[PDB]
Amino acid sequence: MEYLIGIQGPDYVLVASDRVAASNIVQMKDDHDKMFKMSEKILLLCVGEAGDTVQFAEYIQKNVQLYKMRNGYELSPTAAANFTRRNLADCLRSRTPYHVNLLLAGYDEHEGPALYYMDYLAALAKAPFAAHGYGAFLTLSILDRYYTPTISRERAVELLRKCLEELQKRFILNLPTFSVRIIDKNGIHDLDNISFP
Amino acid sequence: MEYLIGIQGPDYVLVASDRVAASNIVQMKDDHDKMFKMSEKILLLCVGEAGDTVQFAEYIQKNVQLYKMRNGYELSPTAAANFTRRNLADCLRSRTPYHVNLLLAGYDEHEGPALYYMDYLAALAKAPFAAHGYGAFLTLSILDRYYTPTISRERAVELLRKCLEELQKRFILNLPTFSVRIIDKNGIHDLDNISFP
Amino acid sequence: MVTGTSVLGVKFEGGVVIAADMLGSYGSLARFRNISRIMRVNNSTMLGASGDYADFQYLKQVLGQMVIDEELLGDGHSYSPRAIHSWLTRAMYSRRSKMNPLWNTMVIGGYADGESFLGYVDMLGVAYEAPSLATGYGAYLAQPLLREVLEKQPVLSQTEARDLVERCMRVLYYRDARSYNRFQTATVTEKGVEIEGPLSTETNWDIA
Amino acid sequence: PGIEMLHGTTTLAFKFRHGVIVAADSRATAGAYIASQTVKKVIEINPYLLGTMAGGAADCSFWERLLARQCRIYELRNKERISVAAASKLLANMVYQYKGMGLSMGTMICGWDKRGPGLYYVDSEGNRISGATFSVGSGSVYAYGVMDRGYSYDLEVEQAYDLARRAIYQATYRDAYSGGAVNLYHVREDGWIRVSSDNVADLHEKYS
Amino acid sequence: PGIEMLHGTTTLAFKFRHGVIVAADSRATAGAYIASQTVKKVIEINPYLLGTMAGGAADCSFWERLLARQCRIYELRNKERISVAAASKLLANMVYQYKGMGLSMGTMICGWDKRGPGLYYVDSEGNRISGATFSVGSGSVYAYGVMDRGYSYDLEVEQAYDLARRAIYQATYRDAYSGGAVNLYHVREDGWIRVSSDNVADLHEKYS
Amino acid sequence: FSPYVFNGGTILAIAGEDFAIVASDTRLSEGFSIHTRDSPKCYKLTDKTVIGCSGFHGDCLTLTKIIEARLKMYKHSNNKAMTTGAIAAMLSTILYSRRFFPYYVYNIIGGLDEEGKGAVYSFDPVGSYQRDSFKAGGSASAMLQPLLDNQVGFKNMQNVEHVPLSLDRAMRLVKDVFISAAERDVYTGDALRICIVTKEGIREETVSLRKD
Amino acid sequence: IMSYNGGAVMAMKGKNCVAIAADRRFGIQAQMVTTDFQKIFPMGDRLYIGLAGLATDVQTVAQRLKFRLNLYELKEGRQIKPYTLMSMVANLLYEKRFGPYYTEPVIAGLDPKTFKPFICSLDLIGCPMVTDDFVVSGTCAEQMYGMCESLWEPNMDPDHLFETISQAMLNAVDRDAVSGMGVIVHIIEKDKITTRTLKARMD
Amino acid sequence: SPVTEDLLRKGFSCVKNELLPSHPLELSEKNFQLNQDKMNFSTLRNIQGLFAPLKLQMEFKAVQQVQRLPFLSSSNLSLDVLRGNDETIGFEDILNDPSQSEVMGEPHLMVEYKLGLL
Amino acid sequence: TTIMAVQFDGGVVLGADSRTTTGSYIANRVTDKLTPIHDRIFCCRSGSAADTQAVADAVTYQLGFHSIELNEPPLVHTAASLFKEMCYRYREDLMAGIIIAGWDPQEGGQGYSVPMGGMMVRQSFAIGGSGSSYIYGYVDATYREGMTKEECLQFTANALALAMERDGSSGGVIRLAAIAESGVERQVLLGDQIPKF
Amino acid sequence: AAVSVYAPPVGGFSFDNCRRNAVLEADFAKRGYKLPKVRKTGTTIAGVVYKDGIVLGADTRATEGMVVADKNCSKIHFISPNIYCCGAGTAADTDMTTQLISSNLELHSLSTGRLPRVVTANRMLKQMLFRYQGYIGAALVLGGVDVTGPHLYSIYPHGSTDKLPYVTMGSGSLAAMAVFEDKFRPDMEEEEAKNLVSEAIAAGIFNDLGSGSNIDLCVISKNKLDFLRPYTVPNKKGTRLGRYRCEKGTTAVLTEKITPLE
Structure with missing residues (x-):
């Protein structure tokens, strides 16, 4: 299907993705950014139906921009997560058989980074590195093997590159290229795309 | 699923393939030759359940080696096709819900080459270039567009390369590398594998 | 789930005749044996119905109420049979479109302005007029004789029409699962509406 | 009832340095019997956009009509032309309002505006993907490969026209539902202009 | 009745310059209740081959027993050791004889013979794929990635043992059915030799 | 329970140069019996527009009774009469109003345009109009159409000129096609009603057809 | 089930002349894989058969019928009368009545002794019937009776017969998705067989 | 339910559906003569005594073993008037007549199988 | 389809109704639902219309063979046992409710019943049929003991005529037949001869 | 020949298609594709027993769904010199299941030297139809005079039998048999019986959809066997008004081959 991973660290919430589309037997578009943006410090990954x-x-x-524009200041990642979960639960149970997976991000100014994992029944954990899609099965062990509790920003990219190489080599589907974004205490930084010839 | 094509010509029955395995979500082996050999002049491609x-x-x-070893001489492609179809029909209707696709080949010594297309209900046509699997949908038009009635052996490889590049670029699955074999009036010649980095 | 048998009818030179069986079937058992199935809604229109019986009661009440209200108002105008037929058609179609069908099949006959009218109001919203008609299971047995006689002769008199209805009752009683010896009839000639019954059908089983 | 219309069809649209090109077939099938041969599918809503047709017929026509009304109302109100993205999102919301009741449509709203070209795609599923190369319907494949092989984003006008004609012809020769006529549409600063219409037989004769 | 045993498990085997190594867990579950903790899965049939276990339990044990009997008979008859390919094809034919009645098994017959090593794979589906890197069962994934990342075909003995231990431990830490003990098997010219057995708790303590 | 049942019928429409023709057989048949043999299926709407409605005979009446009422409303409101170019869209809107409970009809509209010109529209049960020139359809379709395709608009014929349809030819063709197609179909036959309409009014026509 | 492939065949009896025609197409539902696929078999010399339906059973029934015809011809000495093949195919189809085949064969030919034209037909499981004027069967069965009934005429010479069999197919088979793209016409006059290939819409 | 306790000669027959009867007119058509003979034998044994079925069936056995070898068509002129089907032509001889068998086995194999040696 | 039998001193009576049908439509107006097996035993029928005929034919075959083998008149218990053994063995697709009765030289006068399921038992009066459940009370309250032929015939006529009108399956003529020590005599009640109620 | 055969082949109804047929039908049912159909020729059949002999008759329309496949198909077969039958529904099965009994009775007659009796035909038909429990449907009307007297039978597709003096079987039969119920009287004459059966079959043909075209009668009196076909033409096709014939050169041509025979 698709692929979403995010690795934590001392001061970053680095997340990858998979710029790809879907259809019956066809790939409509080869670059479809799945990374919606909330604020200067919050991302929102989402793969589903x-x-x-x-x-x-x-x-x-x-709806998060409304809070900032109505109160001057900005939300916190924990409040954003506890609000998104509530909205998802209330709406899914109401009248719609949804199927959406989410992977929040964010960096506040009091307690490091924060990465949240949410399934499609609106649960909420705080795993230090989660995954979505089908590549989770083949890549989570690789992520767990080399994950030192502290990882430098330089080594995080290398770990991600290995974890994506294994997926690109041992997977049925044809995920051709991936996007990488890293969040620090300066905004939303960007890195060059990961493309496999 | 898989991929099988074969292009005719003046004196060749050139066929491609897809060296790949299958499983739930995993690729067990990346080089599995699907090309069974019948005799010194006959191939037999087969993709199915x-x-x-x-x-x-x-x-x-x-069963074809028995005929040669019991009568000195060798079968003809037309007899091989009309025998394989009969066996497939009788066995499939007997007690087994089979699902197999076949693509015969061969070069006799009286009427050029011969390529046969057979579905899973045991039909028999004589198309000048056929296809199997799912890539047939995306590649048969490409094969039909450039197919001059007469094609030199040099240009056949180039046409095949373009037809496989389009599939590798616009397909969901991850067919990583293909095999190529060409039959002439000298035996079963072989060519270097087609691998996409 | 009480059910009727057949409410067939044929046109006529100045009038209409309708016949029906006084029977009520509880699936297969003959639960009731004296209920009536003919109505006298006004001075120039009569009625007959088959299928379920409770729905027939309900439409009987509603239509009698409507006609009595119209007569009570007082304007020198009445309900011509065409209007009643249209009203029944609309009611049946509206009930069908709401997923609450009335398992019923009726015949409306009358004689106004020196001409005869006869219609079919099948529950699925079917409406038309014809020189002859049959309902329920009589659409296969009762119709052919009437159609043949009408094609041979398009206009009749009272004696042969009455005898034709008698013969049709004879054959239907011979070869139907749900039937009774007695049956009702009512003409709608310009004198008025005259309900007659019960009648009888003499049979012969000499080929036994 | 019976199958409505148009079990499948084909169309394509690519963009390059001189606007957006739209091509379509005309065969509105009804399962196994050809109902028509010259049904127009490139729907015009104003002299700036070009609605497309696929999937069902009546649903597509009705929703393009509503989109045209909304666009005209917005034009009259705000005195400024509406961008393609706004119309695409509007249609996406309207179609996504009803899901699961059997809706089926594929449309490729495209045109020129202040930001240049634009060829957003929307369907019954609800996604609003953009792109630079598209093809929808049953005959989208058998044309996808050829039109992807020929596309270069630096083509001329006549070369692009020939590419579109070749793609449609090769798609309809191998499929079993596309065919009939070929309509070719061009988009520029001054709105769309109809290019030409052609019959499959003549193209087959001249391409043989 | 109830679920028989072993809804899922894990195992792996890779080949390199010094033979073939086999690793396995031991937890024969019964749906939602752990039935045992030290059930041996690396099945011995003779001091040249090493049958594996996966899928169901009773079916796997019975078919390995039949394969062992056939191999012993062939040994006694032809005075020559049987190659691994012959045994693999034999088991493939026997398992493919019954299909659709609920058979479920995954076996990785491996050993040394006149042609060197060999690690053919067969299952209930009927394919007889070869290879140089394998893992079957529910916990095959979560180990496939690690054991593919570490494999180099030029490893030493202790390095290969450590790689196998790490792969099994990382697979069983994340899954929910594998675990218990870890059995490690080596194959060489003079037949297999048992390497060691270990408990998950000690490996977790020493790898923390 | 099933709120649908078949009733047969056949509709044919020729749109010539300055004349529209709508004709239809007349037989209400359901299951295996015959209900009647008159049952006309060609109703008039205005002085220059005729509607033919085949299909299930429980909505063929409702749509007929609704279209006239809406036409009266439009005439009272806008102080005019609907032309044949607007009735198509209005009926399409009414038909699509119940896309989740579709009407089981196959309607054909024929009439004159603003100027003297033939015009025959064609719908589908869900509701989607499309202009045509010789479109037919109904229960016993797929037999009427190919012969008209051969005759009216010369197709798959070479070295033959093009001649406009004359009024004398139209009835002679329609009668022949109905006579030919009545035998091999079950639901057709009985009486045939023709509603040829020109710029002087509407005139009827009835002929025998495989007497049954 | 006669939609997994395509096919359509006619037969008209003229004046000492019989004509049989078919349509060349073989495709798996929407897809198409070839344009040349024979559906007319030369059984005898002035006799022909017109199998049309699911192809995978067409081939098998043609092979079995050819085998049995060769056996009977060799054993009994002289040629086979056209009426005999009718009962032949009837028996062959009823052989598997419970496990039915998928074929609607058409037989058209001449008597080797009398030269009196003969045409028959068959249903799915074998029910012999003979029509004097014409007969037709195939996937697109509905859209040919209307085209054939009006255009037919008794006592037709070979030229008019060819024109009628061409006009009753060329513009009457294109009104359908499957079973198109090519028409073969076989005209069997008294002394010489003649084959023609028409051209139709390539869609 | 048997284990193995040449696949080219006999192959391509899955165990799945022989223990799953086809169209219900399968056991009443594959085994018809045997069932009719069994019913007649049971009736005679019940009403006439134990001698008649034994005598008649052993007569069947005596007359059965004088036909030609299995790899050729058997005339079966005798055993027919004794069976009782002397003129009862039906759906047993006009449909798929065994004389024109579409497929035929090897002579030695068929005769050795008829002997039951295999 | 009402069938009933009554036993008196020296013989028994037997009645039936001729209205075999096929649902809501009458198949045959007058039939003979009374088969004369051998010359004394009589066998009525119910249930289906073909299995009963086959069973009756087989019973006729076997019983005639037995009677001519022993060179003695048959005993009704033999017929009852034969019917039981035939019906019970095939208790899967042989839905045929049967009632048999007759006279024999030894203990003359017997009425046997054998409903669906193969069970066999004897009773003074037997009643069976789809429309044979509306007269249980009447027959229980009216049937005394010690009656001769005339009043038995009248009682059977009245009891059968009662259900003859309160059902849809029944209707038509009546087929009383009495088997006695000497022979068999039959008569039919038609028209007003049928008692009203 | 072959290398994978052990036992000699056995004749009879083959069954090596249902396994594929079931899965193919399951595949094609949910995809809205075409479905197979057979010539379910629902036709009216009438028979009456007059003073001397028997009179039979049936209509001659053979449909295969909603399309008129045939306009002239005999519904009366030959069984013996003085026995005739009729068919109704699934004409393919009824043709063979009547021809088989005809041949068997011919063999019996040749072996006996005397004319067959109707009860033998009834017994054989009943035995065969009950042996094939369902799955084969051919309602028959068996009638014929013999050495004893006139007879008539009404075999059903499950094995039931009757001995009515008049019978009407088929899809559309109620109209004709009601005409019989109204007009029939015992011990009629020949011409009156013919007129009555013609009138009944005419009512049945007019008031139904499964029947049409010509009718025929099969008087089988004691010392004279008659077979009138057709007897009466109730409906006649009209005439084509305009000529639509195409002349030479109308149609195109791509390739042409000419091969001369001898």
Whole structure:
């Protein structure tokens, strides 16, 4: 299906993705950014059923800017997570058989980074490195093997590159290229795309 | 699923393939030759349900050598096709819900080459270039566009390379490398594998 | 789930005749044996129905109420049979579209303005007029004789029409699972509506 | 009832330095019987956009009509032309309002505006993917490969027209539902202009 | 009745310059209740081959027993050791004889013979794929990635042992059915030799 | 329970140069019996527009009774009469109003345009109009159409000129096609009603057809 | 089930002349894999058969019928009368009545002694019937009776017969998705066989 | 339910569906003469005594073993008037007549199988 | 389809109704639902319309063979045992409720019942049929003991005519037949001869 | 020949298609594809017993669904010199299941030297139809005079039998048999019986959809066997008004081959 991973660290919430589309037997577009943006410090990854993902992300994204614009300051990652989970649960149980997976991010100014894992029944954990899609099965062990509790930003990219090489070599599907974004205490930094010839 | 194509010509029955395995979400082996050999002049491509393909091909292959070894001479491609179709029909209707696709080949000494297309209900056509699997949908038009009625052996490889590049670029699955074999009036010649980095 | 048998009818030179069986079937058993199935809604229109019986009661009450209200108002106008037929068609179609069908099949006959009218109001929203008609299981046995006689002769008199209905009752009683010896009839000639019954059908089983 | 129309079809649209090109077939099938041969599918809503047709017929026509009404209302209100993205999102919301009741449609709203070209895609599923190369319907494949092989984003006008004609012809020769006529549409600063219409037989004769 | 045993498990085997190594867990579950902790899965059939276990339990044990009997008979008859390919094809034929009645098994017959090593794979589906790197069962994944990342075909003996231990431990830490003990098997010219057995708790303590 | 049942019928429409023709057989048949033999299936709407409605005969009446009422409403409101170019869209909207409970009808509209010109529309049960020139359809379709395709618009014929359809030819063709197609179909036959309409009004026509 | 492939065949009896025609197409549902796939078999010399339906059973029934025809021809000495093949195919189809085949064969030919044209037909499981004027069977069965009934005429010479069999197929088979793209016409006059290939819409 | 306790000669027959009867007119058509003979034998044994079925069945056995070898068509002129089907032509001889068998086995194999040696 | 039998001193009576049908439509107006097996034993029928005929034919075959083998008149218990053994062995697709009765030189006068399921038992009066459940009370309250032929015939006529009108399956003529010590005599009640109620 | 055969082949109804047929039908049912159909020729059949002999008759339309496949198909077969039968529904099965009994009775007659009796045909048909429990449907009307007297039978597709003096079987039969119920009287004459059966079959043909075209009668009196076909034409096709014939050169041509025979 798709692929979402995110590795924590001392002062970063680095996340990867998979710029790809879907159809019956065809790839409509080879570069479709799945990374919706909330604020200067918060990302929101989302993979799920077609249409419902881009609708729910848009609805939950044109609601956090309202809080900032109505109170001057900005939300915190914990509040954002505990709000997104509540909205997802209430809406899914209401009238819609949704299927969406989410992977929040964020870096506040009091307690390091924060990465949240959420399934499609609206649970909420705080794992130090999670995964989504089908590549999770083949890549989570690789992520767990080399994950020292403290990882430098330089080594995080290398670990991600190995974890994506293994997936690109041992997977049925044809994920051709991946995107990488890293969040620090300066905004939303960006890195060159990971493309396999 | 898989991929099988074969292009005719003046004096060749050139066929490609897809050296790959299958499982739930995993690729067990990346080089699995699907090209069973019948005689010094006949190939037999076969893609279908797991197990039944390698059983039916083995049974139909340890039956053509018997004819040669019992009569001195060798079968003809037309007889081989009209025998394989009969065996497939009788066995499939008997007690087994098979699902196998076949693509015969061969070069006799009286009427050029011969390429036969057979579905899973045991039909028999004589198309000048056929295809199997799912890549047939995305590649048959490409094969039909450039197919001059007469094609030199040099240009056949280039046409095949373009037809495989399009599939490797616009397909969901991850067919990593292909095999190529060309039959002439000298035996079963071989060519270097087609591998995409 | 009480059920009727057949409410067939044929047109006529100045009038209409309708016949029906006084029977009620509880699936297979003959639970009731004296219920009536003919109505006298006004001075120039009569009625007959088959299928379920409770729905027939309900439409009987509703239509009698409507006609009595219209007569009570007082304007020198009444309900021509065409209007009643249209109203029944609309009611049946509206009930069908709401997933609450009335398992019923009726015949409306009358004689107004020196001409005869006869219609079919099948529950699925079917409506038309014809020189002859049959309902329920009589659409295969009762119809052919009437159609043949009408094609041979398009206009009749009272004696042969009455005898034709008698013969149709004879054959239907011979070869139907749900039937009774007695049956009702009512003409709608310009004198008025005259309900007649019960009647009888003499049979012969000499080929036994 | 019976199958409505248009079990499948084909169309394509690519963008390059001189706008956006739209091509389509015309065969509105009804399962196994050809209903028509010259049904127009490139839907015009105003002289700036070009709605497309696929999937069902009546649903597509109705939703393009509603989109045209909304676009005209917005034009009259705000005195400024509406961008393609706004119309695409509007249609996406309207179609996504009803899901699971049997809706089926594929549309490729495209045109020129202040930001240049734009060829957003929306369907019954609800995604609003953009792109630079598209093809939808049953006959989208058998044309996808050829039109991807020929596309270069630096083509001329006549070369692009020939590419579109070749792609449609090769798609309809191998499929079993596309065919009939070929409509070719061009988009520029001054709105769309109809290029030409052609019959499959003549193209087959001249391409033989 | 109830679920028989062993809803899932894990195992792996890779080949290099010094033979073939086999590793396995021991937890024969019964759906949601742990039935045992020290059930041996590396099945011995003779001091040249090493049968494996996966899928069901009783079916696997019975078919390995039949394969062992056939191999012993062939040994006694032809005075020459049987190659691994012959045994693999024999088991493939026997298992493929019954299909669709609920058979489920994954075995990785391996050993040394006149042609060197060999690690053919067969299952209930019927394919007889070869290879140089394998892992079957529920916990095959979560170990596939690590054991593919570490494999180099030029390893030493202790390095290979450590790699196998790490792969099994990392697979069983993340899964929910594997665990218990770890059995490690080596193959050489003079037949297999048992390497060691270990408990998950000690490996977790020493790898922390 | 099943709120649907078949009733047969056949609709044919020729749109010539300055004349529209709509004709239809007349037989209400369901299951295996015959209900009647008159049952006309060609109703008039205005002085220059005729509607033919095949299909299930429980909605063929409701749509007929609704279209006239809406036409009266439009005439009272806008102080005019609907042309044949608007009735198509209006009926399409009504038909699509119940896309989740579709009407089981196959309607054909024929009439004159603003100027003297033939015009025949064609719908589908869900509701989607499309202009045509000789479109037919109904229960016993797929037999009427190919012969008209051969005759009206010369197709798959070479070295033959093009001649406009004359009025004398139209009825002679329609009668022949119905006579030919009545034998091999079960639901057709009985009486045939023709509603040829020109710029002087509507005139009827009834002929025998495989007497049954 | 006669939609997994395509096919359509006619037969008209003229004046000492019989014509049989078919359509060349073989494809798996929407897809198409070839344009040349014979559906007319030369059984005898002035006799022909017109199998049309699911192809995988067409081949088998043609092979079995050819085998049995060769056996009977060799054993009994002289040629086979056209009426005999009718009962031949009837028996062959009823052999598997419970496990039915998928074929609607058409037989058209001449008597080797009388030269009196003969045409028959068959249903799925074998029910002999003979029609004097014409007969047709295939996937697109509905859209040919209307085209054939009006255009037919008794006592037709070979030229008009060829024109009618061409016009009753060329513009009557394109009104369907499957079973198109090519038409073969076999005209069997008294002394010489003649084959023609028409051209139709390539869609 | 048997284990193994040449696949080219007899192959391509899955165990799945022989213990799953086809269209219900399968056991009443594959085994018809045997069932009719069994019913007649049971009736005679019940009503007439134990001698008649033994005598008749052993007569069947005596007359059965004088036909031609299995790899050739058997006339079966005798055993027919004794069976009782002397003129009862039916759906046993006009459909798929064994004389024109579409497939035929090897002579030695068929005769050795008829002997039951295999 | 009402069938009933009554036993008196020196013989028994037997009645039936001729309205065999096929649902809501009458198949045959007048039939003979009374088969004369041998010359004294009589066998009525119920249930289906073909299995009963086959069973009756087999019973006729076997019983005639037995009677001519022993050179003695048959005993009704033999017929009852034969019917039981035939019906019970095939208790899967042989839904045929049967009632048999007759006279024999030894203990003359017997009424046997054998309903669906193969069970066999004897009773003074036997009643069976789909429309044979509305007269249980009447027959229980009216049937005394010590009656001769005339009043037995009248009682059977009345009891059968009662159900003859309160059912849909029954209707038509009546087929009383009495088997006695000497011979068998039959008569039919038609028209007003049938008692009203 | 072959290398994978052990036992000699056995004749009879083959069954090596249902395994594929079931899965193919399951595949094609949910995809809305075409479905196979057979010539379910629902036709009216009438028979009456007059003073001397028997009179039979049936209509001659053979449909295969909603399309009129045939306009002239005999519904009356030959069994013996003085026995005739009729078919109704699934004509393919009824043709063979009547021809088989006809041949068996011919063999019996040749072996006996005397004319067959109807009860033998009834017994054989009943035995065969009950042996094939269902799965084969051919409603028959067996009638014929013999050495004893007139007879008639009404075999059903499950094995039931009757001995009515008149019978009407088939899809559309109620109209004709109601006409019989109204007009029939015992011990009629020949011409009156013919007129009555013609009128009943005409009512049945008019008031139904499964029947049409010509009718025929099969008077089988004691010393004269008659077979009138057709007897009466109730409906006649009209005439084509305009000529639509195409002349030479109308159609194109791509390739052409000419081969001369001898």
